[PDB]
Design a protein around this nucleic acid. Structure first.
Ligand SMILES: [Mg+2]
Ligand SMILES: [Mg+2]
Ligand SMILES: [Mg+2]
Ligand SMILES: [Mg+2]
Ligand SMILES: [Mg+2]
Ligand SMILES: [Mg+2]
Ligand SMILES: [Mg+2]
Ligand SMILES: [Mg+2]
Ligand SMILES: [Mg+2]
Ligand SMILES: [Mg+2]
Ligand SMILES: [Mg+2]
Ligand SMILES: [Mg+2]
Ligand SMILES: [Mg+2]
Ligand SMILES: [Mg+2]
Ligand SMILES: [Mg+2]
Ligand SMILES: [Mg+2]
Ligand SMILES: [Mg+2]
Ligand SMILES: [Mg+2]
Ligand SMILES: [Mg+2]
Ligand SMILES: [Mg+2]
Ligand SMILES: [Mg+2]
Ligand SMILES: [Mg+2]
Ligand SMILES: [Mg+2]
Ligand SMILES: [Mg+2]
Ligand SMILES: [Mg+2]
Ligand SMILES: [Mg+2]
Ligand SMILES: [Zn+2]
Lengths: 135, 116, 99, 97
RNA sequence: GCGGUCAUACGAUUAACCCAAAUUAAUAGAUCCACGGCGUAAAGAGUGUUUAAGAAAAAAAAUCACAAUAGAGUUAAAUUAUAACUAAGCUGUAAAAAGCCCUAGUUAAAAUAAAAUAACCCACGAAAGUGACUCUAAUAAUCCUGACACACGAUAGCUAGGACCCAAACUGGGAUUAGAUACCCCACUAUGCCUAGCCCUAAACCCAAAUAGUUACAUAACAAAACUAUUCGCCAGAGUA
RNA sequence: CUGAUG
């Protein structure tokens, strides 16, 4: 018939050995496909033990240097007037234009944080965006 | 807010004396307790007081004062109508409170996961 | 070829940062008798209530404005190895594509 | 070789921590007007954390100052001084519904 | 464990099985307990320090609000000894009875005992233990484990002196029961209170030993998930105990 | 309120 065992291993590891033993005298059609293109991980059963102690997950947080600049704009003026449009792939927000102006002014050899921060807000008035400083 | 729970129970990692001694394991069940015969209060008490005031003043006769007899019947009819209509309106809607018969089905949709 | 690392940095979700009080635009995709499932576009769809002003102007496919509060309501309780996800989002109605 | 990889940095959007009403303040045992804003006007029970909302430091010092002022003769125990009844309500408890 | 008219288990017969000039029965023997455990089955000893003794196998540190403890001073609520007005009732249980009518309420009131809310706080101390206020002294180790030695060790018990509002072992009454030397009600004592000196016991339980760590293999059951390296003290069926 | 045993 077959092997209804789960914790021993994978379906391939349970069918190939059975066919080698000679009980299953008919080869499944998917076995040739599995031998031709095996997956990256063998589907072995693994029990999700809970993580105790000082151990922590191996995932690393996502943070960029642009976030350190966006924090300044979000603490100074808050949310921009032009609402975000999550459907447009190339949508550029007010804070995105601000951090672009910031990183552009950084190349001019400006090391003062105030010089890099207020000049971008003053230059955005040339493009003509409206800023609402939260006080 | 919710009281603190760190350093309360008796565990191997807790170095001090356990503070809380739970009778049963502090696991949030997937069904709430059924309300013990939720009751209600009477009605038209103020309308009955001013009605019996006529009886006590005019020596128990209805031909003397009449509006205190008609408003009492109107309050009784309105209470009788609200006892029947709201008994279905509040069970169809969920703006305010709700019986546990729906809280249980709401919790079973998103139950707690003790294992895994 | 543009890999994933470059296309993720230029995502509007990355530019938005935290989801606390952000003005976004969402297109309604389903209509109930009184509730509105508005998909702001990030992960989930927020459920809002139909206001009394221009409540008839809200139809299937209309774009509206929202102030995003939370992206996905998840929290932990007693004896829960994982969180209890609401499979929704938190947002309020301000306008309907003021333009 | 990619330059758009996330960098292991701190959280820039980390909001400041919530402060208690007396955070970075100087509590005393003689300001009866200050200590009365945390006791019940009808009985004199000292309100707890769930009603006041004070962080771990000032909560105990307020209680110590109240207990000192109730024995030294600064503030009555069985009730609240009615002269300090017109003080602004700081607690989060509502009696008259 | 089998023996109440169906005994393959008793006594006899037949038959069969296993040894064999040996077969059974009894007693001695060899071997067999733990390089395994100590939360619920026997087991982490009530706590700390220290001698002897043992590994210091790679690097790090010592100490902060809050009720440790020991002395001295103090009292906010209630209660009471005591006086004054009022009433014949007060306390008492599911219902009563007994007891007190030098009783009961209000206004004042020392001495003693204890220390509402804060406390949904979790700190201090080695443990027991500690949270009404203030003052003085002070809470070891440039920090491993380690006794039968040393020093502590809640309530309860003893001795001497003092205190006694209140609660109460015991005792005397009143209920209920067939009986109640008990649960229910009243009165009262030792005692609980302070100093000095003993006694050194607990479900002294967090039933989980200390020192530095891990989330690797891995659910007897339940319970607080499974474990490492050095140790200390215990565990050989149960009752007898 | 109370109600013992097989
Ligand atoms: Mg239990
Ligand atoms: Mg239960
Ligand atoms: Mg026979
Ligand atoms: Mg025989
Ligand atoms: Mg053994
Ligand atoms: Mg045992
Ligand atoms: Mg022990
Ligand atoms: Mg012992
Ligand atoms: Mg003393
Ligand atoms: Mg007094
Ligand atoms: Mg009598
Ligand atoms: Mg006296
Ligand atoms: Mg006290
Ligand atoms: Mg300690
Ligand atoms: Mg020390
Ligand atoms: Mg030592
Ligand atoms: Mg006495
Ligand atoms: Mg007495
Ligand atoms: Mg007696
Ligand atoms: Mg004694
Ligand atoms: Mg003792
Ligand atoms: Mg104890
Ligand atoms: Mg033991
Ligand atoms: Mg099972
Ligand atoms: Mg030891
Ligand atoms: Mg024995
Ligand atoms: Zn504070």
């Amino acid at each position: 018939a077959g092997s209804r065992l789960e914790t021993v291993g994978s379906i391939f590891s349970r069918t190939r050995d059975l066919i080698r033993a000679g009980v299953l005298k008919e080869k499944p059609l998917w076995l040739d496909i599995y031998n031709a293109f095996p997956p990256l991980r063998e589907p072995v059963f693994r029990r999700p033990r809970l993580r105790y102690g000082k151990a922590k997950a191996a995932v690393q947080d996502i943070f960029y240097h642009e976030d350190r600049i966006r924090a300044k704009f979000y603490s100074a003026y808050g949310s921009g007037p032009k609402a975000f449009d999550l459907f447009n792939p190339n949508f550029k927000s007010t804070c995105q234009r601000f951090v672009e102006k910031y990183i552009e002014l950084q190349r001019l050899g400006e090391t003062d944080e105030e010089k890099l921060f207020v000049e971008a807000g003053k230059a955005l008035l040339a493009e003509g965006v409206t800023l609402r400083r939260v006080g | 807010a919710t009281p603190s729970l760190r350093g309360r129970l008796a565990r191997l990692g807790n170095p001090r004396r356990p503070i809380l001694k739970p009778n049963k394991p502090l696991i949030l069940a997937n069904h709430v307790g059924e309300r013990r015969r939720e009751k209600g209060e009477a009605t038209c008490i103020t309308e009955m007081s001013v009605m019996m005031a006529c009886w006590k003043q005019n020596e128990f006769r209805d031909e003397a004062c009449r509006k205190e007899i008609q408003d009492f019947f109107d309050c009784a009819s309105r209470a009788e109508a609200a006892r029947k209509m709201r008994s279905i309106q509040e069970n169809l809607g969920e703006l305010g409170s709700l019986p546990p018969k729906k809280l249980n089905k709401l919790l079973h949709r998103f139950p707690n996961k003790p294992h895994v | 070829v543009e890999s994933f690392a470059s296309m993720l940095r230029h995502s509007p979700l990355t530019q938005m940062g935290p989801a606390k009080n952000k003005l976004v635009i969402g297109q309604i995709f389903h209509i109930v008798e009184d509730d509105l499932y508005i998909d702001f576009g990030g992960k989930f769809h927020c459920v809002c209530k139909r206001p009394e002003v221009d409540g008839e102007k809200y139809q299937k496919g209309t774009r509206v404005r929202l102030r995003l509060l939370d992206l996905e309501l998840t929290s932990r309780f007693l004896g829960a190895t994982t969180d209890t996800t609401i499979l929704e989002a938190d947002a309020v109605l301000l306008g309907l594509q003021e333009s | 070789s990619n330059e758009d990889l996330p960098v292991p940095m701190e959280n820039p959007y980390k909001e400041p921590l919530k402060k208690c009403i007396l955070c970075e303040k100087h509590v005393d045992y003689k300001n009866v007007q200050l200590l009365s804003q945390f006791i019940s006007p009808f009985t004199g029970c000292i309100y707890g954390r769930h009603i006041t909302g004070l962080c771990g430091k000032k909560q105990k010092e307020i209680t110590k100052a109240i207990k000192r002022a109730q024995i030294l003769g600064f503030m009555p125990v069985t009730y609240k001084d009615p002269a300090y009844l017109k003080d602004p309500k700081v607690c989060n408890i509502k009696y008259r519904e």
